[PDB]
């Protein structure tokens, strides 16, 4: 409250870290179905379902250039990804293990990195 913090947890690599982290989930062999937005002049049914589209170009792009405020609200936005893969194909399909796998390499490296 007022006067009254708990010890300051050391944020000042964590920009370096999630950047490393997204280039990590970027090589990943199974991160091409989120390496670009989704055509949403292609895509029957998809920008009016998905109302926050998001993927890893974009996020990289909000990363650099200091879109994101802290830590979570760039995980939030990864999970996003999945999140969004997940609603629109079934479990299934290539694309849809392919977002399993890929929300799973997430989170450990998320858990490991900072946890
Ligand atoms: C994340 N991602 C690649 C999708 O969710 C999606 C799913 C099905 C598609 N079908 C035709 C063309 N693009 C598509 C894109």
Known sequence: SMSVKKPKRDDSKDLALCSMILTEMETHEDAWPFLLPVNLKLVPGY????????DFSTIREK??????????????????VFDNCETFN?????????????????EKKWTDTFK
């Open 90 to 106: 079934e479990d299934d399909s290539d694309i849809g293990r392919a977002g399993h796998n890929m929300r799973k390499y997430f």
């Open 63 to 80: 990363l650099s250039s200091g879109q994101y405020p802290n830590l979570e609200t760039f995980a939030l936005d990864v999970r996003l």
């Open 47 to 54: 920008k009016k379902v998905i109302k926050k589209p998001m």
